[PDB]
Design a protein around this nucleic acid. Structure first.
Lengths: 215, 129, 71, 168, 83, 150
RNA sequence: UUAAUA
RNA sequence: AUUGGAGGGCAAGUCUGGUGCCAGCAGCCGCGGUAAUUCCAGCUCCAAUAGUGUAUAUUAAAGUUGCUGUGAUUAAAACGCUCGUAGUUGAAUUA
RNA sequence: ACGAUCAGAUACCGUCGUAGUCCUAACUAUAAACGAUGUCAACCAAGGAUUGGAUGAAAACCUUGUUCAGAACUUAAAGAGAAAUCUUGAGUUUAUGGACUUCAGGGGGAGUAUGGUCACAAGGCUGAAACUUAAAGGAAU
């Protein structure tokens, strides 16, 4: 409640009815409550609880770092990282960060347009640190052929079928999820053949409702 | 030394599109380079091209329109049997609807789709998404 | 049934490439028509010149871009 | 002397520069200065007609403070005179979280902080660029002199007139 | 270059600046000229970048000296470009 | 780049886009052939023969006037030297370096460059034998080249 | 100037 | 209805009795110095099931043998440098 | 070989001093022989300066415009990488293929033993195994 930004005000007034409108014009989300309004009932799943330490004169300062993945099972996903002194708060802090880090997931078919969309449209590669995760489209029957760490994330994004090939120090849990989030992130940035058409001209929600937000 | 002129040309085209350039220039022109461009035009990956005659294996200027993700040549042109097509596409192309290979066959230089229709194999030249 | 695409992405008016949902440097200039510039073009120091070509194409400018550059 | 630029010429302003002067100073094209200025003013007028507060004009250098402040008066667009706080466009919890839909900067070399933040908030920018200035993170550049007091006051006053005492 | 010009129709000035080989269609920067002799009226045609002493066909008021890239014609030798 | 050192220069000549003789040129092939014929009898390399015609007679390209190259013209008249010009000049340098090396035994840079020069000779001799220019009985020898090159 | 070890 | 296990890899007990850096467990990290989640037992449930553990070897994992497919500045790894035969690779061009 | 210092000092400090350091002829063929970055070729973001040319202007030297070759330097929100950093590449690589050669496979044992070969000799080139061990190592906080 109590929005601060324009997009926060617009969604509270119920003028931006779909999250896809925000993704259409590339508007940054700065309040996690915006995602709560537009994507209700998001499933949750905490990837890991890694504890870091900083050496001090009096000893060590242990903080808990939480990797949480959020996203509805219909093509949206988000990954957020937060570290703090308490496990309960760190999850809550990473809970917020996951919501502002929502990204669209473009998925397609394997060989024909029959049924609903199940798999990625082309080959995508995550570009984290030494870890690199490749996703390949797969037929209908095959599940998410992947390690448990990115399988948990890919389940949330709604990708039912995929083939994976990982490379690097995949034992690094944080980079393993980050690499998957990166391959998914650029799904809508890779221009395939069907996206050649420029389509029509659409009005930005911040310009059509610029007057009301001022008043 | 210049071993593969086609490799030089396709690297120039891919580099130009990553920088967003409008048109690019290729210094050595060949029949094979022209055929590869014609295949890419039929799929509307390049607007057009012109060939200038310098009496010295002249130059080619290619106009690009935001559509060629990557065109690359394939080193030694393997003898691709008709049964080895889908093995090559599964390796080199992103999906089953997006890209196209290029093969040199006795019926000319054709992509994988119409070479399959004409029922003929040959050496593989390259591909483009 | 349901539409297979989440949304139809915008096309940059300069490089004719898609505008990613995470591209937080991509702008939209309204000339009382819509112009979209990708974030990569802006950071390179060229978006000013690229818009000059597009502005001259649509008539908003006449004697800015020379003929040899008008492509 | 708005036409007279600096000595070193940026690669992005070569089109606007007409011919180097007698002692190796760049001389801008007057028609190109007006053509860019009229286009920029039209863009500002299009946005500012509904919501004046969404156009932000910043002016770091001291001889541009007064010119920008009157531009605030005669158009209603918010003007930033002193130093630009690094985060006033990105920190929403900050009490001075001002949101623009367009940014006007007196000098890219001095007001770089405002320009660089425009790459985080999806906001086009307009600048009064000199022949030496770097044309990064700007979208409409007005080739002019932005060091001498006369040119700074005139260009802002000319821009204010087209959107619809300035000298520092 | 980040800013790009047309690659099919280069300007007259732009082609002149470029190296003799890096033009659209490479052209030599040299030419053939004739030199009227200071001693007589005969005109001797010779290369612009001659690599030897240039003598008249009549006598030999030597008309030029080869100097590493272009003939060093005498100050009193007048020439025109053979088109 | 150059064959033997990392130097990389592009100093070339630029043939004009006009394969025919220029309009202002009026000398026919008869004068061109005989003028070239007289130069060959004087013991002048084909590369230098064309330069003399270009500098003095204004015949900058001979193929644009006669339709055949200088070497082809000289072969028809039979005045082409038995040893190809480029190979001949290479064996002239190998002889000259060797003569200097007889008195200066301690010169270690001349020994290196003589090795590079002789490797060039064995590259050209191999090529000209495949082109049937030189009979297979030909062979470069230090004790022999001093006389034929002389 | 000299200053080894746990 | 048995076989193996119940600290992590790896599903399963921060239950109770003895043992006290001993006996031992432990493929790896490791647990045990008297309050053991890992020893020896009792109860319970974890996996598979007429099968289930162990030991050696093949294959996958191993993009840690590379054609698809690796790495060579600093992690292991560009001959001190040049010439050079076999070998490998070789510009455009022919209705 | 003396004299100091020190617990001792066969060392650092001081004095003397042989082989050597220098030239000629012949061996040896190793270096942190380093840019720790093989050779050739294509594409490639902004600059300022410099060495040697060619070409206009300004009266060999110097100031400027263009262009070719060379050793370098600065900026990058871009590309790459584990990072340091690289940008005349260490870029154009899971969107993996321009041509060729050499080398590496956890740390030791070990460049050791043996065998072969070269050298007057010291040594050089090629070069293991048994056994032992969960780490050794790289960049950064």
């Amino acid at each position: 409640w109590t929005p601060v930004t324009k997009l926060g005000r617009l969604v509270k007034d119920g003028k931006v009815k779909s999250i896809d409108q925000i993704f259409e014009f590339g508007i940054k989300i700065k309040e996690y409550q915006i995602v709560d309004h537009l994507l209700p009932g998001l499933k949750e799943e905490v990837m890991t609880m890694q504890s870091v330490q900083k050496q001090t004169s009096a000893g060590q300062r242990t903080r808990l770092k939480a990797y949480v993945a959020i996203g509805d099972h219909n093509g949206h996903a988000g990954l957020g990282v937060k570290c703090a002194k308490e496990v309960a708060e760190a999850i809550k802090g990473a809970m917020i960060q996951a919501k502002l880090a929502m990204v669209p997931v473009r998925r397609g078919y394997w060989g024909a347009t029959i049924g609903e969309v199940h798999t990625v449209p082309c080959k995508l590669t995550g570009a984290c640190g030494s870890v690199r995760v490749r996703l390949v489209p797969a037929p209908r029957g095959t599940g998410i052929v992947a390690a448990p760490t990115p399988k948990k994330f890919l389940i949330l994004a709604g990708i039912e079928d995929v083939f994976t090939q990982t490379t690097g120090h995949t034992k690094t849990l944080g980079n393993f999820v980050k690499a998957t989030y990166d391959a998914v992130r650029q799904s809508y940035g890779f221009q395939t053949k069907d996206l050649w058409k420029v389509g029509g001209v659409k009005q930005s929600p911040m310009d059509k409702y610029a007057k009301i937000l001022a008043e | 030394v210049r071993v593969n002129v086609l490799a030089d040309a396709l690297k120039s085209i891919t580099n130009a599109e990553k920088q967003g350039k409008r048109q690019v220039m290729i210094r050595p022109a060949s029949k094979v380079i022209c055929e590869f461009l014609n295949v890419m035009m039929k799929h509307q990956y390049i607007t057009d091209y012109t060939v200038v005659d310098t009496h010295r294996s002249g130059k080619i200027v290619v106009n690009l329109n935001g559509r060629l993700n990557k065109c690359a040549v394939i080193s030694p042109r393997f003898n691709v049997t008709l049964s080895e097509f889908d093995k090559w596409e599964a390796n080199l192309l992103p999906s089953r609807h997006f890209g196209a290979l290029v093969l040199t066959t006795s019926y000319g230089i054709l992509d994988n789709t119409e070479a399959r229709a004409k029922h003929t194999g040959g050496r593989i030249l390259g591909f483009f998404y | 049934n349901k539409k297979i695409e989440l949304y139809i992405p915008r096309h940059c008016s300069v490089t004719h490439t898609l505008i990613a949902a995470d591209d937080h440097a991509a702008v939209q200039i309204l000339v009382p028509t819509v112009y979209t510039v990708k974030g990569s073009v802006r950071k390179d120091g060229i978006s000013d010149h690229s818009l000059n070509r597009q502005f001259q194409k649509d008539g908003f400018l006449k004697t800015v871009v020379p003929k040899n550059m008008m492509i | 002397r708005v036409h007279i630029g600096a000595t070193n010429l940026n690669f992005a302003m070569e089109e606007y520069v007409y011919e180097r002067g007698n002692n190796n100073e760049c001389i801008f094209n007057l028609m190109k200065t007006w053509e860019k200025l009229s286009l920029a003013a039209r863009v500002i007028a299009g946005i500012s007609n509904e919501t004046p507060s969404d156009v932000v004009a910043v002016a770091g250098r001291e001889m541009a403070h007064r010119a920008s402040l009157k531009f605030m008066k005669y158009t209603g667009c918010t003007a930033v005179a002193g130093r630009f706080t690094p985060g006033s466009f990105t920190n929403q919890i900050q009490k001075k979280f001002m949101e623009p839909r367009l940014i006007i900067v007196s000098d890219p070399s001095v007001d770089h902080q405002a320009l660089r933040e425009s790459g985080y908030i999806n906001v086009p920018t307009i600048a009064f660029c000199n022949s030496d200035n770097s044309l990064k993170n700007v979208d409409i550049a007005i080739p002019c002199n932005n060091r001498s007091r006369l040119s700074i006051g005139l260009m802002w006053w000319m821009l204010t007139r087209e959107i619809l005492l300035f000298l520092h | 270059p980040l800013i790009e010009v047309d690659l099919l129709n280069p300007t007259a000035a732009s082609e002149a600046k470029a190296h003799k080989m890096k033009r659209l269609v490479p052209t030599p920067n040299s030419y053939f000229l004739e030199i009227k002799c200071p001693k007589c009226g005969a005109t001797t045609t010779t290369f612009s970048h001659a690599h030897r002493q240039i003598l008249c066909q009549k006598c030999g008021q030597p008309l030029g000296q080869p100097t590493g890239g272009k003939l060093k014609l005498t100050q009193q030798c007048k020439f025109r470009i053979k088109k | 780049g150059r064959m033997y050192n990392p130097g990389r220069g592009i100093s070339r000549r630029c043939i004009p886009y006009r394969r025919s003789a220029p309009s202002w040129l009026k000398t026919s092939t008869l004068e061109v052939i005989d003028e070239m014929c007289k130069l060959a009898k004087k013991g002048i390399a084909p590369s230098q023969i064309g330069a003399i015609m270009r500098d003095t007679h204004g015949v900058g390209l001979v193929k644009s006037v006669t339709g055949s190259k200088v070497l082809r013209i000289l072969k028809l008249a039979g005045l082409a030297p038995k040893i190809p010009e480029d190979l001949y000049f290479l064996m002239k340098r190998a002889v000259s370096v060797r003569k200097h090396l007889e008195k200066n035994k301690k010169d270690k840079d001349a020994k290196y460059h003589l090795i590079l020069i002789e490797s060039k000779i064995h590259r050209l001799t191999r090529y000209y034998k495949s082109a049937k220019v030189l009979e297979a009985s030909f062979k470069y020898d230090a004790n022999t080249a001093s006389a034929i090159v002389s």
